[PDB]
C-alpha cells in the first residue's frame, strides 16, 4: 500500500522555515520505510540560497496541491 503523495504529483510545502513554504514542487520519490521521519522528496524550480532545488519533507508537510500554472509559484 503506497503511502504519501504519488510520484510526480505536485505538493504544497507546509514547513514554515522552508525556503519554499507555501510553494509547490514535484514529488521525486517517497520513502516507504515507516522508520523514516522525512520520507517525501520534493524538487523545485526555484533554488534556495544554497543553490539546492530539492529537499526531503515529512509526511505532514505536503498537501498535494494542483499544478502551478502560468506565472505562479
Q: Is 17 in the site for other proteins (CB under 8 A)?
A: yes
Tell me, residue by residue from 43 to 72, as one string, x for binding to other proteins by CB under 8 A and - for no binding: ----------------xxxxx------xxx
Question: Using CB under 8 A, which of 7, 10, 14, 42 touches other proteins?
Answer: 14
Of 8, 25, 34, 49, the residue at the interface with other proteins (CB under 8 A) is: 34
**What residues form DSSP beta bridges with 54?**
43
What residues form DSSP beta bridges with 62? 13
9 contacts 28 by C-beta, under 8 angstroms = no
Rounded Cα–Cα distance for residues 41 and 27 (Å): 6
Amino acid at each position: 500500500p503506497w503511502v504519501g503523495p504519488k510520484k510526480g504529483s505536485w505538493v504544497k510545502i507546509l514547513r514554515p522555515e522552508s525556503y519554499w513554504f507555501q510553494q509547490r514542487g514535484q514529488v521525486v520519490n517517497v520513502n516507504q520505510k515507516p522508520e523514516v521521519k522525512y520520507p517525501v522528496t520534493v524538487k523545485f524550480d526555484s533554488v534556495n540560497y544554497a543553490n539546492v532545488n530539492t529537499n526531503g519533507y515529512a509526511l505532514w508537510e505536503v498537501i498535494e496541491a494542483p499544478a502551478p500554472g502560468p506565472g505562479e509559484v
